[PDB]
Amino acid sequence: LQVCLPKGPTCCSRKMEEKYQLTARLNMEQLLQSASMELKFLIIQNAAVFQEAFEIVVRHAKNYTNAMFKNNYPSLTPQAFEFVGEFFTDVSLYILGSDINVDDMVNELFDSLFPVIYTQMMNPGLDINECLRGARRDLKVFGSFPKLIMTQVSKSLQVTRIFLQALNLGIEVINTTDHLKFSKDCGRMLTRMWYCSYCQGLMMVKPCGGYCNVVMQGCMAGVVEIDKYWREYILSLEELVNDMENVLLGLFSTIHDSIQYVQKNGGKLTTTIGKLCTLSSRRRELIQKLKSFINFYSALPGYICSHSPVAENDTLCWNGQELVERYSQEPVVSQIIDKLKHINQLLRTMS
Amino acid sequence: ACNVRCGRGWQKRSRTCTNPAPLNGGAFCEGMSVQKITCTA
Amino acid sequence: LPHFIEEPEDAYIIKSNPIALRCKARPAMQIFFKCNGEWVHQNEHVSEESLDESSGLKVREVFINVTRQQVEDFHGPEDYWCQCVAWSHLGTSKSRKASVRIA
Numbered sequence: 209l210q211v212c213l214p215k216g217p218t219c220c221s222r223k224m225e226e227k228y229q230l231t232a233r234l235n236m237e238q239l240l241q242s243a244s245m246e247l248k249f250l251i252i253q254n255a256a257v258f259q260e261a262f263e264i265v266v267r268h269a270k271n272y273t274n275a276m277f278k279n280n281y282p283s284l285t286p287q288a289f290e291f292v293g294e295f296f297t298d299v300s301l302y303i304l305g306s307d308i309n310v311d312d313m314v315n316e317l318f319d320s321l322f323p324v325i326y327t328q329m330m331n332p333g334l335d336i337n338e339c340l341r342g343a344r345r346d347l348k349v350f351g352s353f354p355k356l357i358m359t360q361v362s363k364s365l366q367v368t369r370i371f372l373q374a375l376n377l378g379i380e381v382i383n384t385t386d387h388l389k390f391s392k393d394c395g396r397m398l399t400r401m402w403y404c405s406y407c408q409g410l411m412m413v414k415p416c417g418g419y420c421n422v423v424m425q426g427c428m429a430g431v432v433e434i435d436k437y438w439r440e441y442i443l444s445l446e447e448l449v450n451d452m453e454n455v456l457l458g459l460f461s462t463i464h465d466s467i468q469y470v471q472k473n474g475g476k477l478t479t480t481i482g483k484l485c486t487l488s489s490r491r492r493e494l495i496q497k498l499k500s501f502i503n504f505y506s507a508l509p510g511y512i513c514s515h516s517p518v519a520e521n522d523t524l525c526w527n528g529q530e531l532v533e534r535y536s537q538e539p540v541v542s543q544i545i546d547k548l549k550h551i552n553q554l555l556r557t558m559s
Numbered sequence: 560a561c562n563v564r565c566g567r568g569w570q571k572r573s574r575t576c577t578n579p580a581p582l583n584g585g586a587f588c589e590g591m592s593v594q595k596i597t598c599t600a
Numbered sequence: 601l602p603h604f605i606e607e608p609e610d611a612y613i614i615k616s617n618p619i620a621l622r623c624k625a626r627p628a629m630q631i632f633f634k635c636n637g638e639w640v641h642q643n644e645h646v647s648e649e650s651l652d653e654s655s656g657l658k659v660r661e662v663f664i665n666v667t668r669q670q671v672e673d674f675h676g677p678e679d680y681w682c683q684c685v686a687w688s689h690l691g692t693s694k695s696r697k698a699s700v701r702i703a
């Protein structure tokens with residue numbers, strides 16, 4: 209045998225020892241999954257809910273922009289629907305983490321908006337389209353409105369994008385916890401602590417509390433080091449929540465005023481161009497519920513021992529090799545800590 | 560489960576982009592994230 | 601059974617121009633569209649009661665408009681598809697699934 213220290217005879221062979229080792233692995237994975245399930249489901253629920261809520265806000269804003277174009281500028285439809293749809297599609301794609309340039313969204317929006325304004329509102333009556341698109345930026349027809357919208361929406365969209373990325377990475381690391389493979393030495397120590405008592409013919413004897421403590425603090429030396437970075441992650445997320453619903457909902461007034469602003473100098477513009485051519489409640493409850501799991505990694509070995517059958521009294525217990533009267537006494541973890549450091553820097557820089 | 564007891568119902572299946580999650584400007588998952596089918600209950 | 605003469609071909613919406621779907625079968629008395637699993641409203645259907653030259657039998661041609669708003673607001677699993685069901689004195693017949701997508 210290579211695990212069960214044979215002091216007397218033994219009721220189990222080497223193959224039974226391998227079976228006990230695999231059952232020890234499975235029991236450890238089950239205990240980790242039971243410890244991490246509540247938090248995993250909490251973050252999954254919140255990620256899904258926030259995603260749907262942000263999509264609802266974006267859909268309502270696109271609907272109101274289309275409706276206000278239908279009502280106030282019927283001469284700009286149906287082209288207005290095209291550039292509004294493209295703008296809010298790129299908005300949603302940026303929120304969901306795609307490589308989209310916010311300044312490019314606003315600039316393409318105004319580039320598409322100006323030619324139809326000129327042809328239908330200012331000078332009623334396809335090839336000259338690009339000359340108008342160039343004149344939009346060359347003559348600064350929209351004033352500071354494009355940069356105002358640019359900053360207004362970039363500030364909110366970046367914090368929302370990083371909030372969702374933080375939720376996703378929390379889901380990732382909490383999923384990773386219950387799949388943590390351990391050392392071979394720890395496999396043998398867990399087999400001794402949980403099952404090797406059966407090889408000596410004992411039926412209901414449990415391992416000593418102190419033996420469980422030494423074994424767990426033995427193989428969780430790396431996992432416990434994650435606690436600092438996990439605490440910093442929780443607190444940085446709290447820093448970030450303390451943005452985007454208000455901004456996207458005021459966009460329509462700003463766009464209407466920008467169209468008015470361009471129409472205000474039509475006299476000179478036409479001649480020159482003719483010559484030239486419950487959310488905040490949810491994130492608050494989420495942070496208040498997430499602060500209840502700040503001890504998750506530090507309380508984890510305590511959980512494994514308090515949910516495994518152990519003799520807390522350290523009397524008439526199994527010490528891994530014999531029944532005693534009193535007890536005598538990187539890589540995946542590195543990746544978890546790397547990603548936590550990255551997300552923590554990214555959080556702290558936002559707020 | 561089909562939300563409507565009688566007639567046309569709905570069935571949803573989610574597919575998240577988290578295994579692995581994009582980092583430092585990595586390309587995001589390509590295609591649809593939700594799947595919805597009509598069911599007759 | 602009803603034999604389809606003009607089966608609907610997969611349409612593509614370009615620059616928000618709503619392109620209707622054609623459907624023609626003989627012998628047919630009722631032709632309806634099943635877009636994405638569910639029946640299309642009676643008002644959307646435009647029926648034509650034609651007579652064929654090759655054979656004196658009742659032909660039916662139905663057109664249904666598909667707007668950009670219908671495709672962009674559809675959040676289903678597969679591509680926005682539509683099917684044609686024709687009714688005869690003997691039974692029914694389904695056509696090709698034309699999937700209208702926002703190119």
Ligand SMILES: *[C@@H]1O[C@H](CO)[C@@H](O)[C@H](O)[C@H]1NC(C)=O
Nearest residue numbers: 264267268269270271272275
């Ligand atoms: C969609 O447009 C309608 C008509 O103006 C409006 O009543 C509704 O609030 C809008 N919905 C969304 C999602 O914007």
Ligand SMILES: *[C@@H]1O[C@H](CO)[C@@H](O)[C@H](O)[C@H]1NC(C)=O
Nearest residue numbers: 617618619620663664665666
């Ligand atoms: C559908 O409506 C559009 C209007 O933009 C039109 O171009 C198309 O030919 C129509 N088909 C119908 C009315 O069946």
